[PDB]
């Protein structure tokens, strides 16, 4: 299989979600979906060592390096398209939740 299928990878359905934006951006959002990720394929979990912190960031990282021609094309012009997509980006990659995550103890 060829590597479109990446770290980051979008997942485009289509399906309108419910996330509040900002003003401007939940219009944007309300009017565009269709353009919009509504998954991403990573996967950060490994070990109980990795944390949601480490993962989140991460997920976003592997994003950014996956999907750069999107990023690119439409940065230059529409501005608020990518303050949007960031925000839902974020809001995949903190769903997207480890099993094994656990109360560890440290001195």
């Given at each position: 299989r060829v590597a479109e299928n990446r770290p980051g990878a979008f997942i485009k359905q289509g399906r309108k979600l419910d996330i509040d934006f900002g003003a401007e951006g939940n219009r944007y959002?309300?009017?565009?979906?269709?353009?919009?990720?509504?998954?991403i394929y990573y996967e950060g979990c490994s070990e109980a060592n990795v944390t949601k912190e480490m993962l989140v960031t991460s997920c976003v990282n592997a994003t950014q390096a996956a999907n750069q021609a999107e990023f690119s094309?439409?940065?230059?012009?529409?501005?608020?398209?990518?303050?949007?997509?960031?925000?839902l980006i974020k809001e995949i990659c903190s769903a997207?939740?480890?099993?094994?995550?656990?109360?560890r103890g440290a001195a």
């Open positions: 959002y309300a009017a565009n979906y269709w353009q919009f990720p509504d998954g094309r439409e940065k230059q012009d529409s501005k608020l398209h990518q303050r949007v997509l960031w925000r997207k939740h480890c099993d094994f995550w656990l109360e």
